[PDB]
Write a protein that binds this ligand. Structure first.
Ligand SMILES: c1cn2c(n1)ncc1nc[nH]c12
Ligand SMILES: c1cn2c(n1)ncc1nc[nH]c12
Ligand SMILES: c1cn2c(n1)ncc1nc[nH]c12
Ligand SMILES: c1cn2c(n1)ncc1nc[nH]c12
Ligand SMILES: c1cn2c(n1)ncc1nc[nH]c12
Ligand SMILES: c1cn2c(n1)ncc1nc[nH]c12
Lengths: 236, 237, 237, 237, 236, 237
């Protein structure tokens, strides 16, 4: 057991899918995993282990923000044998050609957090996904007939930014989606020698809004959960 | 409703005690409040409203880290008429003369986050509590016979910090507790125009490596809660 | 003797009021102390020791700016047994509801100096006063019938700042007064192990451009001095 | 023409290979392209346009260092309709398991340069390659019987860095190769909306050394150019 | 009158010599200026105007540190018509070949202050003297048979540094003297369009100490006060 | 030999002239030196050693940008006993009174590069020339009937900067010329204990433009080389 996870080695699979919302982890285990057992409830951060097409898989919330997800991904890597983290989340778009319900894969993650500068002697650490995990996700999306955009996310510390001028900057430099975790998870994965990937669905357009239905949005969220099939591709 | 709270104006008291652990908010409402009703469960961040000695009072988790609690404290302040936030958390100690379950009152909060530099044009913003709230908490602690140190906390972004040497610097400058929120809450309170205070219980020593359990963290920090609730009463006078 | 003070251990009281203007220290000693003797004139930085209602008390200028007052507060703390520094200065106001001769108590001090980043590994050090000293000053002000706001000061390196827009940011974040020392004094107190507090009199408004004379700045700020001296008396209890 | 390229729109293919050493451009054009024509000579930075298996390709050196290649890549993109840039060159390795003449593909590039912080309001821009170009290079290498590593480069401003400890940090965080351009090319690509990739062969080990021979550095260069060119044809799909 | 100088246009010469110590300004007026009148005493920061070989010259303290001297040099430039500031001060040496009582001329001034980054959009502003003033000082020292070193000073914010490792850095990069004002004065002079020069005598060796006599040290201080003759050379 | 210079100790004079454009080195050697011999050719960066009025001089180009010239100047100083480096090149002007083909001598060099902050523990290093070399150049120019301005250069990392407002700041603080190397050469000179100077002719005005012709840029280049070479003889005293 670690200070934020009341579990033991073996309780997690060597791959963990992580949404921000602990209730969304419950949704995923119940919708997609067979024989799911709950393996953590400390601080309400529900985590589960079951099987997908016979493959052992865990899913667990990571909370909002780089500091929260850094705790959980660290402890999973160093104390529960986890090799792969797949964040499965929502993001806001700044580019006009990125539409509601697009699937975005973060090959890199920009940030206004200081955590990677602290790690990297105040220089620029390029916070990146594991390439093979990216490729597995692109291929799994193709097999399902979904086109995924691959590029940069931006991991914000302030959901409610006082700036607002920073969204123009993100647009100018081609940021595909704004969320709050990827850069921290990629930093954790480099620091402790594991592999990580962030996939997001566009849940709003920070400029404008666009228009869809609940059924359509929930369909795309389930499409993202690509993540499970990418694991199977990785297993080779 | 706000993007992270499914409630309406009036569901929250004008004062909200906030631990990081939503299960601890649930424990506070069951143990200390009367007629406690649940007013939020979005993302599992349980929030409750009830009364303490007749005073309407809410309690709601804020999650771990400056970005998490920044979301919740903002929405409480801008859409639910919340005037005072009292964070009631845990912290790790670096000073030798600070032992487990000691109560610390962060008049100020150091940080290695960039959020206040982003608000303050890259200068030093002294993240501070409301003075009257600090004094209320000190007086309530004296009336309860509970010791409490008043000083600087350090709000860390990395619970698992790769810079162990920074603990020596925290120690040198008298930091009473390492937690993960205060400096961001004080920044929100200033940005959005309310008042805040962080009280913490020392739950582990970073040097001695003695620590309290996860079950103890959510259900044994009762002195802190009493200080927090009684300090509201003094503030209402 | 230290490199900037020609005196010996015992010449200073354990509490030193310090304005920036050495002529103001001279005025304080003549007007408020009894049996005042001069204990330093190096570089014209006049310092005096006497008694206030029987309590040994010193007063000495610290010069303008964080680097100037850092020298003097350091030497007082490390070679003259000084335990408490009470800065008694002037400040410029940015908030509309803050008028000339208002008294401000800096529980914290923002700054655009780099000195605390250099002490604190480039992180945010919340430069704060001693809590008991702040409360002493608040209580002494109430007993004297003098209003006083408690909050953040901003310690500027550039009196003539080329960034006028930073005043808007100070205003947004509730900065009660722009002066040039508090954040450095609070940093010295923490580094070298003593306690400090800055009290300031609003001597000009940065927006309205109303200002007090240079002669008024050195001889009309009497309410502040009374608060400072009486707060020491409360602290001795 | 532009300040550093004396040519007209249309003289360059939409894909440009860029070695560092400008003398290698003429080599590539004569060894791997058909029907090559000279399209630039300003300050000895020779450029050529030709075909590889019918596909229009240009090649031109970029100089050493982020400021140099930032100039040439910008002008190609904004004034010559270039859509893809492939930098081909050498790097030094810090990882014990990365060996001399290994092929490294920079999906990302760390840097100690300030150029991206100037672009990105002093936040962290992740300087990344175009994903399809990365994958094209991996597959083209595979088809040539070459396993290629994919991960982070580090683009150093100072070949002779005074901070020997940074190489240990690079190794801790998995940096595959040290060179001097990738992060700057990636930033320009993002700034003006084109696509870029850096491929490097390991020419030396910062740990120990025992560098490579002459015919080995000839075989290995040819493999890298072959990989880059076949990757373009894969990108055409 | 300005907020820190109780004087009027005309009261100062268009060149001001400035030591840190207001008592040292009094010493200089009394030792070197004819018909000296005191023209400022606000905050005890004594300033004087007299003549040197018939040339009108002022001298005035500037206090310790960049923030203090920035106030006084600013107000002198924008409100009293001053064109040239010559700081005349003491510095500590870090180089082993820089000896006690060497005369050091700051063609540039390094600093750990943030004031020039604030002025210069967070980039590196090279805080420099006016070249002609440097050359006049070198020539005046030569005519007096004194060899002056010209190079970098370092302007510290903390006389009592918590670092201490920074002195090795200054030594490595050839810093001739450590004081507390030059970089701020050069920043003021660029910002408001005036000219400035810092001359220092080495009053200690931050490593080791060396050994001289009071009479010898006071002789070298008077040699520095070079400054007066450099003005006359500047007048052409 | 060094990684970028295939030569031996003694092949270079103790004084090296460095243009940016490497093709200018052969020009200088053939036009102003006697008995010139080729001493380097690695990646087309030709170097030559000869005499000017009996004085041994070398010339070799430095590439564009701080990282490029930092490599070559370092290796010359640490491995070829070089004592003085004179960079000769062009710059852009922001000041209305600085005119095309004016000669500018960089007593100091501002920069938006991070290299000196990496050297100087993130403080402000003033990147400065050697004073005697400055004065030698002024006097040599005077003797040729050329008035030369002396002050600050700005060494830009990005020729194509995304912050158009920085040119206004440069103009406010008196920058005489914008180029891309001076501050980096000055930092290397200080790091390894040698002497350096950058001389520039104004080739364009950032304000407006209306650049210079061909025979004008020929006359002006020759004047700059003449100034640099006569300045060396003045330095020999
Ligand atoms: C603006 C929007 N936004 C954000 N800032 N951060 C995270 C996020 N997730 C969905 N939408 C988001
Ligand atoms: C070491 C300990 N520690 C920490 N670092 N950060 C936050 C925190 N909360 C309780 N204990 C904590
Ligand atoms: C504007 C005003 N102002 C200032 N900036 N800094 C320090 C200070 N002391 C009194 N008044 C002050
Ligand atoms: C150490 C090594 N090294 C470097 N630093 N930078 C660029 C580069 N290219 C090959 N080898 C290199
Ligand atoms: C160490 C020494 N030192 C200093 N730091 N700063 C200014 C100064 N003037 C003389 N000696 C000095
Ligand atoms: C604008 C202009 N400019 C520049 N930025 N950098 C270097 C340079 N050399 C000549 N002209 C230049």
């Amino acid at each position: 057991a670690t200070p934020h996870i009341n579990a033991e080695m073996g309780d997690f699979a060597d791959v963990v899918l992580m949404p921000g919302d602990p209730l969304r982890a419950k949704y995923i285990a119940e919708t997609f995993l067979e024989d799911a057992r709950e393996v953590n409830n400390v601080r309400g951060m529900l985590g589960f282990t079951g099987t997908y097409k016979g493959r052992k898989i865990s899913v667990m919330g990571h909370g909002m923000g780089i500091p929260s997800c850094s705790i959980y991904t660290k402890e999973l890597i160093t104390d529960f044998g986890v090799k792969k983290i797949i964040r499965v989340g929502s993001c806001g778009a700044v580019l006009p050609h990125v539409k509601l319900r697009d699937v975005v894969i973060g090959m890199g993650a920009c940030t206004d957090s200081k955590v990677n500068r602290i790690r990297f002697k105040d220089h620029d650490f390029a916070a990146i996904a594991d390439f093979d995990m990216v490729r597995n996700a692109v291929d799994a999306a193709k097999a399902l007939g979904i086109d995924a955009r691959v590029g940069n996310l931006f991991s914000a510390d302030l959901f409610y930014s006082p700036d607002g001028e920073m969204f123009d900057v993100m647009e100018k430099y081609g940021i595909l989606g704004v969320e709050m975790e990827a850069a921290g998870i990629y930093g954790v994965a480099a620091e402790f020698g594991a592999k990580a990937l962030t996939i997001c669905t566009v849940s709003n357009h920070i400029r404008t809004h666009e228009q869809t239905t609940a059924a359509e949005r929930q369909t795309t969220f389930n499409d993202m959960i690509i993540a499970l099939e990418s694991v199977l591709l990785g297993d080779k």
